[PDB]
Structure 1
Amino acid sequence: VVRVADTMPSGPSNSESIPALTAAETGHTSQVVPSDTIQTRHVRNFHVRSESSVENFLSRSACVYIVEYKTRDDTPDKMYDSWVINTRQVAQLRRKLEFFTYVRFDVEVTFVITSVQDDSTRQNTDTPALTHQIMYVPPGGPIPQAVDDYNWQTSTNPSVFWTEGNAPPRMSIPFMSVGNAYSNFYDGWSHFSQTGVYGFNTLNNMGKLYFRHVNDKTISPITSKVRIYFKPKHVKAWVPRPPRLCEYTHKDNVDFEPKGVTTSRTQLTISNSTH
């Protein structure tokens, strides 16, 4: 229970006190209250800065990527799909995270899996309930190269199984950084001779997910599309920075085209005219 500050009453004044005259050249934001310039009354103010905290602002589930894979194909690479894990391919969650330079949060991951029967000649089937497998590979593990590969056993890797029609699968993930905060921006190189790649692509290194159908080759193609929802919780955030004006281009760099600073007015003084 922390309220905002009340407005205290004031009266007429004539003295050498000057709250309105300041100097912003010291990098100092003036602490001028409205009871310093005009005559105000006493207002008991009951507003709470509640839904503006860093916890309430970021803790919302957000779609980060769409993953598509099928259940029977000629080519085996279209029967499973993978995704190198980053939060920088959807601009909403990325632009919400790029208010700060360093962040520290636990993650809550929820998958939403939907199935669509593809167009074929033999659509009149009776298919039992599909079961999907979502295997997480920590950085360095073995990579499956088919749906029938023996790396899908999950002897050590975390996994989750979902039968069609239930609630979405949900698990929590602790703070996984090797440093003390997830560096949203990294101004530096990868090699000590200042060559290689420039940006935050060196410090990503979070692992990658794998998706397949546990069932075998069916007699009709079905396209599965699973959506990943991240929810940052237990949040700490440091050293803020201005939001991005320009539209993004890629996931691995920060590059852009120059955009105008704001929308034009075509005049500079207001009037009671067509404004």
Structure 2
Amino acid sequence: VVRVADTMPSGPSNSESIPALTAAETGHTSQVVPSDTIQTRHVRNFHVRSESSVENFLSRSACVYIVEYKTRDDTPDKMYDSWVINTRQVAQLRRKLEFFTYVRFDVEVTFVITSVQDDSTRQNTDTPALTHQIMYVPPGGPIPQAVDDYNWQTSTNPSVFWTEGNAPPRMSIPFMSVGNAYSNFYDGWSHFSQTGVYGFNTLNNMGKLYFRHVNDKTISPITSKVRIYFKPKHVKAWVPRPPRLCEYTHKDNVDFEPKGVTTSRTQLTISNS
């Protein structure tokens, strides 16, 4: 229970104390309460800065990447589908996380899967319930190479089985950074000769996901689309920064084109027009 500050009463004054005059040339942000400019009354203000906390601002489920993969095709790479784990491919969740320089959050993942029946000659089938497998793979793990390859066995790796017709799956992920905070910004190279790649990409190292259909070769292909919703919680954030003005270009850098700082007025002085 923490309220905002109230308003103290004031009166007619003639003093050498000057709240209006300050030195903005020192970087000190002035602290003038409205009780020092005009004659403000007593206000018992009960506003609570509740829904502006760093926990409340970022703990909303946001999409990161759509994954599309069918259950039977002609090529083995259009069946299952993988994804390298990153939060920097959709500008909303990325732009909300790029207020800060370093953050420390646990991730709570929720998958939402929809199945679209493709068009063919024999669409009138009696199709049983589909099944989905989502195998997390740590950095350096084995590479699945087919829908029937024996690397999908999960002797150790985290996996989840879902059947269409239930609530969507949900699992939590603890803090997995090897440093102390997920670096949304890293100004440096990879090689110690100041060469290689420039990122922002040297410190991703999150691993990758994999998707496949557990069911066998069906007699009708079904386009599956799964949506990943990250939901951070227990959030601590440090050393903030202003948000991004220009639009994004890619995921592995910060590059852009220059944008005008705002939209023009075509006048400079307001009037009744």
Quickly name the TM-score band, shorter chain normalised: over 0.9
> Deviation of residue 213 (structure 1)?
0.3
Q: 1:151 aligns to what SS in structure 2? A: coil
> Deviation of residue 126 (structure 1)?
0.3
For residues 190-212 of structure 1, give each alpha carbon's deviation from its aligned partner in whole angstroms, at most 9, with x where no partner exists. Answer: 00000000011000000000000
For residues 209-233 of structure 1, give each alpha carbon's deviation from its aligned partner in whole angstroms, at most 9, with x where no partner exists. Answer: 0000000000001000000000010
Q: Identify the residue that residue 188 of structure 1 maps to in structure 2.
A: 188
Q: Identify the residue that residue 102 of structure 1 maps to in structure 2.
A: 102
CA distance in structure 2 between the partners assigned to 1:22 and 1:77 by the alignment: 66
> Deviation of residue 15 (structure 1)?
1.3
TM-score between both structures, scaled by the size of structure 1: 0.99
Q: 1:51 aligns to what SS in structure 2? A: coil
Structure 1: 4+ residue segments shifted above 6 A? none
> Deviation of residue 269 (structure 1)?
0.1
User: Structure 1: 5+ residue runs without aligned partners?
Assistant: none
For residues 37-68 of structure 1, give each alpha carbon's deviation from its aligned partner in whole angstroms, at most 9, with x where no partner exists. Answer: 11000000000000000000000000000000
> Deviation of residue 118 (structure 1)?
0.2
> Deviation of residue 178 (structure 1)?
0.2
Q: Identify the residue that residue 224 of structure 1 maps to in structure 2.
A: 224
Q: 2:239 aligns to what SS in structure 1? A: strand
Q: 1:35 aligns to what SS in structure 2? A: helix
Q: 1:56 aligns to what SS in structure 2? A: helix
Q: What number of residue pairs does the alignment pair up? A: 273
Q: Identify the residue that residue 240 of structure 1 maps to in structure 2.
A: 240
CA distance in structure 2 between the partners assigned to 1:105 and 1:15 by the alignment: 51
CA distance in structure 2 between the partners assigned to 1:175 and 1:92 by the alignment: 22
CA distance in structure 2 between the partners assigned to 1:37 and 1:63 by the alignment: 47
CA distance in structure 2 between the partners assigned to 1:16 and 1:166 by the alignment: 72
CA distance in structure 2 between the partners assigned to 1:124 and 1:180 by the alignment: 55
Q: 1:77 aligns to what SS in structure 2? A: coil
Q: 1:79 aligns to what SS in structure 2? A: coil
For residues 83-139 of structure 1, give each alpha carbon's deviation from its aligned partner in whole angstroms, at most 9, with x where no partner exists. Answer: 000000000000000000000000000000000000101000000000000000011
CA distance in structure 1 between the partners assigned to 2:236 and 2:200 by the alignment: 20
Q: Identify the residue that residue 51 of structure 1 maps to in structure 2.
A: 51
User: Structure 2: 5+ residue runs without aligned partners?
Assistant: none
Q: 1:136 aligns to what SS in structure 2? A: coil
CA distance in structure 2 between the partners assigned to 1:24 and 1:82 by the alignment: 53
CA distance in structure 2 between the partners assigned to 1:263 and 1:148 by the alignment: 56
CA distance in structure 1 between the partners assigned to 2:240 and 2:24 by the alignment: 20
CA distance in structure 2 between the partners assigned to 1:207 and 1:161 by the alignment: 20
CA distance in structure 1 between the partners assigned to 2:202 and 2:22 by the alignment: 45
CA distance in structure 2 between the partners assigned to 1:205 and 1:150 by the alignment: 25
> Deviation of residue 249 (structure 1)?
0.4
CA distance in structure 1 between the partners assigned to 2:137 and 2:72 by the alignment: 24
CA distance in structure 1 between the partners assigned to 2:251 and 2:153 by the alignment: 31
CA distance in structure 2 between the partners assigned to 1:215 and 1:15 by the alignment: 83
TM-score between both structures, scaled by the size of structure 2: 1.00
